[PDB]
Design a binder for this molecule. Structure first.
Ligand SMILES: Nc1ncnc2c1ncn2[C@@H]1O[C@H](COP(=O)(O)OP(=O)(O)NP(=O)(O)O)[C@@H](O)[C@H]1O
Ligand SMILES: [K+]
Ligand SMILES: [Mg+2]
Length: 785
């Protein structure tokens, strides 16, 4: 009818891309969300819908609208780097045919093309907030046409979610300062979306946006809870008396039986488990039982139509900086796998693709995946309502059970929450539970608050708020004031700590050098005080014989990245060379405190002055980072310190970004000598390499491992690599592969095996990759001239 996608004036290049797989007609709620109101005119919109209902199409049609009609640039903001990268490639594939340049601002990644020569920028929260501030410093704010926010419910409380408010308030503040222009239409449109929030109307009013809400969902979700053999619904009514056709020993809350039942019916199952260790243990059991039950009585997958793709998955894992996991090597041949934060992001990209293609039918995951990328399944099983020793959060629950039901595939989506008689009441609480109202995170015996101090600093230093009148005008645009002193307290704080200047033109506020430095560094004003002192302390007495002391200055300690074994730490302390003990003493690492940690598990940290704990945690971390840029194997670092490869990769990408911040901060203060030393560690922390490999790693396909083996074989630079014979590069790459046996038959059937993974990847052969490396090296060599 009228909701036919071809009747919406869709460009042919995009219309076919939509018709490429499904997407011929729209939903009832999608048509009402666009037409009703002035949404297509330029009015802001805040809409909510259940997961897997088609929230993406609404935004896509609006973005494609403004970009092509108004010829302005769009901003897409996503919570995590993984979902941001996924969204980039998904939007690129649709719009590359219409000459629409789409790049991304994610974590440490930087766009090759300037923002001025783009159309759609995909960002995380941190990078988006920074880009906005960049446009303010350059006054090129007129470029921005609209901002799209995914998961608008992260506005309440998160590690970086509060920045979403400061970002939006900043947009609402600038457009209000332009409302006093008295002219004589569209400006900057804000499209926000989330899950069903109780105070969603409050959010739409704050942004002066039209509201929309629906409960529509193409596949019905059957939320249930299992106690023993019986399965009940949300009203405690029995919906199924489960009886295992076959039975095995073990814990067995019919967990294997439920999964086996699902696979036999040609479906797939997601199994959520509390700890990282349970996922691997359970994935091993299920795969083992799947072998016994099928034949009625760590190898290769059976010869089927999917044998090649199963082998490619196992081979791609092997040729990764992580190698092929021992448990995965056993389970994956039988469509079983696990998924947690312990794996590297590259391993998880493989498994999700495997599960999405049907190669993996059973996936035992953690709560990390529930908030990650889009990955649906027929049945979702939650092993227990007790996660991490604490009862499961309501938001986590709705994110898990929301992945039950594949649109266009399954008739229903089933959700089972396994409980006992004791925790029976807590399970029902989750099924009937609903999301809590979104807090402002700028709430006030705390007249001053971090989020506010940062918010006030950004508008003054940026030069969009000078007087005292501008400050309270900004206070009106906040989400905190939307629900209907503290502002004045934050301004004085910025004055007391040399962040801002006051010139009595009565009462006008200007940025200091320390102010302008903090803004350019994307640093929090609360953290900047200790960082500024730490740097001044380091410049009074600095160790240069090793790279440890420099690394300490760029070692992040705002969050715990692992659980440190203190006994292990003290063992490394004694074996620690004298040159590195000097750095420890010079920082604050006292041997006495290390002894009181191993002897007694007293965390203390109740006193604020107990940043003494953070110091030892920070020095422990710098040691890990030291070995990391010394090209020490991940397995050695794992055994030496007691942390998995997942925690390490999350740390280095965090330290790579942080290292860049401290470098900028030092540059804006005129500290050249300090800047000079730090400016080489951002690149080394990223790839985990030494100075020699810095030139090789410019090539996209070359990481730490591939760069070293090519260096040790005669290829030291890109220039040397452009002259390279392709088949020689291929051979050197083949030598870098990790095998359990001391490897490094003739199989000429593996000449087409795609065993090398990339980002936004087609499977690459070891030959094709080598030719790409030499081809890219030549293109770079020419751009170097
Ligand atoms: N208008 C539509 N027409 C046909 N199929 C659609 C439409 N919208 C979504 N889909 C299907 O849903 C799939 C993707 O899931 P989607 O509906 O986009 O979930 P979402 O709500 O946008 N994301 P999220 O809830 O955050 O996980 C698409 O690939 C389609 O198969
Ligand atoms: K690279
Ligand atoms: Mg969405």
């Amino acid at each position: 009818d009228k909701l036919l996608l071809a009747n919406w004036g869709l460009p042919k290049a995009v219309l076919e891309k939509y018709h490429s797989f499904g997407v011929k007609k729209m939903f009832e709620w999608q048509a009402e969300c666009l037409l009703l109101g002035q949404v297509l005119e330029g009015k802001n919109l805040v809409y909510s819908a259940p997961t897997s209902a088609g929230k993406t199409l609404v935004a896509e049609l609006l973005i494609l609208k403004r970009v092509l009609e108004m010829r302005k640039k769009a901003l897409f903001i996503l919570p995590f780097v993984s979902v941001a990268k996924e969204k980039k490639y998904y939007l690129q594939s649709l719009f590359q045919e219409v000459g629409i340049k789409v790049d991304g601002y994610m974590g440490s990644t930087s766009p090759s093309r300037h923002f001025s020569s783009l159309d759609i920028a995909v960002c995380t929260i941190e990078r988006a907030n920074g880009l906005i501030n960049r446009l303010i410093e350059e006054n090129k704010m007129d470029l921005l046409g609209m901002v799209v926010v995914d998961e608008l419910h992260m506005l309440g409380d998160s590690h970086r979610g509060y920045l979403l408010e400061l970002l939006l308030t900043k947009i609402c503040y600038i457009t209000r300062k332009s409302a006093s222009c008295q002219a004589d239409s569209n400006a900057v449109q804000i499209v926000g979306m989330s899950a069903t929030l109780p105070n969603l109307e409050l959010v739409a009013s704050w942004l002066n946006a039209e509201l929309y809400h629906t409960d529509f969902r193409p596949v019905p979700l059957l939320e249930s809870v299992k106690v023993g053999n019986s399965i009940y619904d949300s009203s405690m009514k029995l919906v199924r008396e489960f009886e295992p056709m076959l039975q095995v020993k073990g814990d067995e809350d019919h967990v294997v039986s439920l999964c086996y039942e699902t696979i036999c019916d040609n479906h797939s199952v997601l199994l959520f488990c509390p700890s990282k260790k349970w996922c691997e243990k359970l994935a091993d059991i299920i795969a083992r039982e799947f072998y016994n039950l099928h034949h009625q009585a760590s190898e290769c997958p059976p010869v089927i139509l999917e044998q090649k793709e199963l082998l490619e998955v196992m081979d791609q894992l092997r040729r990764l900086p992580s190698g092929l996991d021992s448990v995965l090597q056993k389970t994956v041949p039988w469509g079983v796998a696990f998924h947690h934060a312990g794996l590297t992001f590259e391993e998880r990209d493989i498994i999700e693709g495997a599960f999405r293609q049907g190669l993996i039918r059973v996936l035992a995951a953690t709560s990390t995946l529930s908030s990650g990328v889009n990955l649906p399944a027929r049945r979702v099983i939650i092993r227990t309502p007790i996660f991490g020793g604490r009862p499961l959060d309501i938001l986590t629950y709705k994110q898990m059970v929301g992945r039950a039901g594949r649109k266009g595939v399954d008739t229903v989506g089933e959700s089972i929450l396994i409980c006992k008689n004791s925790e029976k009441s807590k399970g029902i609480a989750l099924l009937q539970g609903s999301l809590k109202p979104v807090r402002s995170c700028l709430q006030r015996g705390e007249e001053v608050t971090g989020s506010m101090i940062r918010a006030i600093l950004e508008i003054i230093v940026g030069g969009v708020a000078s007087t005292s009148q501008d400050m309270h005008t900004y206070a009106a645009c906040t989400f905190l004031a939307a629900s209907m002193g503290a502002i004045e307290a934050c301004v004085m704080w910025l004055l007391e700590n040399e962040f801002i200047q006051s010139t009595e033109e009565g009462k006008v506020y200007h940025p200091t050098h320390l102010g302008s430095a903090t803004l350019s560094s994307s640093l929090s004003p609360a953290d900047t005080l200790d960082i500024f002192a730490d740097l001044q302390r380091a410049m009074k007495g600095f160790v240069l014989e090793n790279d440890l002391h420099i690394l300490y200055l760029v070692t992040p300690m705002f969050e715990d990245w692992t659980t440190i074994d203190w006994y292990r730490f003290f063992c490394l302390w004694e074996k620690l060379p004298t040159s590195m003990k000097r750095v420890a003493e010079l920082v604050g690492v006292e041997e006495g405190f290390l002894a009181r940690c191993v002897k007694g598990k007293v965390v203390a940290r109740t006193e604020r002055q107990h940043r003494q704990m953070a110091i030892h945690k920070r020095f422990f971390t710098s040691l890990v980072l030291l070995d990391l840029i010394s090209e020490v194997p991940l397995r050695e670092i794992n055994q030496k310190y007691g942390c998995n490869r997942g925690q390490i990769q999350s740390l280095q990408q965090s330290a790579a970004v942080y290292a860049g911040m401290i470098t900028v901060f030092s540059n804006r203060l005129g500290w050249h000598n300090m800047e000079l030393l730090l400016s080489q560690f951002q690149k080394r922390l990223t790839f985990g390499i030494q100075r020699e490999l810095c030139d090789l790693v410019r090539v996209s396909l070359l990481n730490a491992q591939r760069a070293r083996v090519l260096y040790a074989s005669g290829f030291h630079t890109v220039a040397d690599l452009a002259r390279a014979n392709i088949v020689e590069v291929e051979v050197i790459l083949k030598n870098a592969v990790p095998f359990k046996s001391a490897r490094k038959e003739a199989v000429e059937e593996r000449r087409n095996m795609r065993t090398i993974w990339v980002t936004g990847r087609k499977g690459l052969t070891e030959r094709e990759a080598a030719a790409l490396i030499v081809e890219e090296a030549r293109m770079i060599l020419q751009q170097d001239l």
